């Protein structure tokens, strides 16, 4: 859907790249927000239920602690922060990398500062009234 043509085949190396990117995003979140130093690795990103649609569930754990699962909300926040940096890694455009719970929204477009239609109609109405007045005055002057 995104590339149409020239799309690379999805092999194991792509999964490795995805896991590394997820670990990088988690590191960024834990460094720039909570001011802690956590060394995440690609082996701490568990994945399951791989499908030909390239659909799979995943979650993240502690560096070396199996019985420690990172709660989902912090992972959601990290993904929200680093989605822009993740998207261009695989040449996606946020329309082919939906996370089923994280919808993107940034920047309300508000372009018109002056309502150009109003001022344009104003100048036209001014010119038309001055024209009609000068014309009726000329007609009266011409008896």
């Amino acid at each position: 859907s995104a590339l149409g043509d020239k799309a690379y085949e999805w092999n194991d190396n792509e999964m490795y790249l995805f896991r590394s990117s997820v670990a990088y995003a988690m590191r960024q979140y834990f460094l720039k927000v909570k001011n802690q130093m956590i060394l995440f690795g690609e082996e701490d990103v568990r994945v399951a239920n791989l499908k030909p649609r390239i659909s799979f569930n995943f979650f993240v754990t502690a560096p070396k602690n199996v019985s420690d699962i990172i709660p989902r909300t912090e992972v959601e926040k990290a993904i929200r922060m680093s989605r822009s940096r993740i998207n261009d890694a695989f040449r996606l455009n946020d329309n082919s990398l939906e996370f089923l719970g994280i919808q993107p929204t940034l920047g309300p477009p508000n372009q018109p500062p002056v309502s150009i239609w109003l001022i344009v109609f104003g100048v036209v109405m001014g010119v038309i009234v001055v024209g009609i007045v000068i014309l009726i005055f000329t007609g009266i002057r011409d008896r």
Binding site: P52, R53, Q111, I116, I128
Partner: protein
């Protein structure tokens, strides 16, 4: 030489481009072209040239012509004047809309190209998903049409003030009186066509445009069964030619009483039909493109839903193999497939094509669509809106010249009132009475005033005129193969229409119309229905029937009043 043809081009107007394609779309397309051809080849020519000859010979206004023929026949000109004034009120609103669009065509990015986001700022408005951006702009941004005709709202601010602006523009154009010219008319006649070539090229260069051509060309059988197509085509051709308004007669009276009027009539009709067909081609190309795009979007959405549900590999499920995959999936998982079935939709190219965009403002919601994928939208948008504005201004100038002339001879009132003051009063009164088309439900009133039972009294006016000509005063004592008509085309076979079959033609479809009116006994008007995004049918209220009945009566009962008005004097 070429100056005669350039002058004669003026016959084009805002009925060939604005109104003809809407009617063509409304009645199936191909099923609408042949009745137009028949009505042109049997009705337009005889009546048009006979009128022109009457105007040339009488050398005076229609009222004086009626006095010459019969004192009983008085009042036809009054009815034509009332019909013209009724036309003018709702006519000027088209110029108002053109002004609105031209003024809004200066912003970047252009409107009707992107959709306002939802209040969540996470997606687009659901109305835009239902109805495309152009439809949303024309139905909610610029009209705010109420869900039903019965519901009404307060008068709006933009349409009223724009209508006022257009009315003062018309008044200025009347007052200046700088209509006489011989060199700019070349430019005014060449601009419409050269503008239309660009849009024709862009429409023909876009994918799927040929489907609109097959749709508008190929006639059908069921659509031809209805009789309303014939009356609608007759009304359309009468409105486009303008006969019965009393403006032609005038013109003809103006010109020197030695000219081959038949050549003028045929050269007018040919160019009118050719321009109408050309405009229909240009519009229907873009319409077919839009329909094809919507069909493709339907297919894409269905494919995406199926792929997401069944986790099929992307790209594997194509449009061609849709049926095979559907059957195989139904075989594989019959239970959940059957459960999901009601949620599944099915694309229908034909139903989509014949009903994609409908209503009065078709030409507004189609070309703007074409505008949204221009190389430089603003340029061609401005050119097209300016062409529409100038054509509307010329048409308004006409039907005004039509209305003013009978009131000009009223010396009894003009003795103490200058003509400028009377013209201004008339313009202000018509502007005030045209205010009824600027509320949240005024659009339905406008369609009533333009399409439903609108200008049907023109048919009875023409019928009265032709039966009056067919009497002993015509072709038996007066116009009896006289030399006065330049000695050429004297009493030729063309009489077999204008003295022969045409009168019957007038009642042949009238009887069908009145038969269907009583047989069905039901009338339906289109409503927007923003809740779904598609037009629906609703029933007219009783007072709508009452007002349309009195409207047609106002132009119907004129002659019987004149009969008694002459008989009372005849008694003494």
């Amino acid at each position: 030489l070429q100056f005669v043809f350039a002058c004669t081009s003026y016959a084009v107007g805002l009925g060939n481009v604005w109104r003809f394609p809407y009617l063509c779309q409304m009645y199936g397309g191909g099923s609408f072209l042949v009745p137009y051809i028949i009505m042109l080849i049997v009705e337009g020519m005889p009546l048009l040239y006979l009128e022109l000859a009457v105007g040339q010979r009488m050398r005076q206004g229609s009222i004086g012509a009626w006095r010459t023929i019969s004192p009983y026949l008085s009042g036809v000109g009054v009815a034509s004047v009332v019909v013209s004034f009724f036309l003018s009120m709702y006519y000027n609103v088209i110029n108002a809309w053109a002004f609105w669009y031209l003024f809004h065509s200066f912003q970047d990015p252009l409107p009707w190209s992107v959709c306002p986001l939802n209040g969540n700022h996470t997606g687009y408005d659901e109305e835009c998903e239902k109805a495309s951006s152009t439809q949303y702009f024309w139905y909610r941004k610029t009209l705010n049409i109420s869900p039903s005709l019965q519901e009404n709202g307060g008068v709006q601010w933009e349409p009223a003030l724009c209508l006022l602006l257009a009315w003062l523009v018309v008044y200025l154009c009347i007052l200046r009186g700088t209509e006489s010219t011989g060199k700019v008319v070349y430019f005014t006649a060449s601009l419409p066509y050269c503008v239309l070539i660009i849009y024709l090229i862009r429409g023909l260069t876009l994918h799927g445009a040929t489907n609109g051509l097959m749709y508008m060309f190929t006639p059908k059988i069921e659509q031809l069964a209805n009789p309303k197509a014939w009356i609608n085509a007759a009304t359309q051709i009468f409105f486009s030619l303008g006969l019965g308004f009393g403006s032609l007669i005038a013109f003809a009276s103006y010109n020197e009483p030695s000219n081959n009027c038949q050549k003028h009539a045929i050269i007018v009709s040919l160019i009118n039909s050719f321009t109408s067909i050309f405009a229909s081609i240009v519009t229907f190309s873009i319409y077919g493109f839009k329909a094809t795009f919507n069909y493709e979007n339907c297919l894409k959405k269905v494919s995406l839903l199926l792929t997401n549900t069944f986790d099929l590999e992307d790209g594997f499920l194509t449009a061609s193999n849709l049926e095979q995959v559907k059957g195989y999936l139904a075989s594989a998982y019959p239970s959940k497939y059957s459960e999901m079935f009601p949620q599944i939709k099915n694309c229908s190219l034909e139903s989509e094509l014949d009903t994609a965009v409908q209503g009065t403002g078709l030409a507004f919601i189609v070309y703007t669509e074409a505008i949204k994928n221009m190389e430089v939208s603003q340029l061609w948008s401005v050119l097209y809106f300016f062409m529409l504005l100038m054509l509307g201004i010329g048409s308004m100038l006409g039907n005004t010249a039509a209305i003013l002339t009978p009131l000009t001879d009223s010396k009894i009132i003009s003795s103490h009132l200058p003509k400028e003051a009377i013209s201004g009063l008339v313009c202000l009164v018509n502007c005030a009475i045209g205010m009824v088309f600027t509320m949240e439900a005024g659009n339905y009133w406008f369609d009533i005033f333009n399409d439903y039972a609108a200008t049907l009294s023109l048919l009875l006016i023409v019928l009265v005129e032709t039966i009056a000509v067919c009497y002993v005063y015509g072709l038996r004592r007066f116009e009896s193969d006289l030399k006065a008509m330049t000695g050429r085309a004297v009493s030729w076979y063309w009489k077999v229409m204008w003295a022969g079959v045409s009168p019957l033609l007038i009642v042949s479809l009238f009887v069908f119309y009145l038969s269907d009116y009583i047989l069905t006994g039901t009338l339906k008007y289109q409503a927007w229905d923003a809740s779904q995004g598609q037009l629906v049918t609703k029933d007219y209220p009783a007072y709508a029937l009452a007002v349309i009945g009195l409207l047609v009566a106002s132009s119907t009962m004129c002659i019987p009043l004149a009969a008694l008005g002459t008989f009372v004097q005849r008694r003494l």
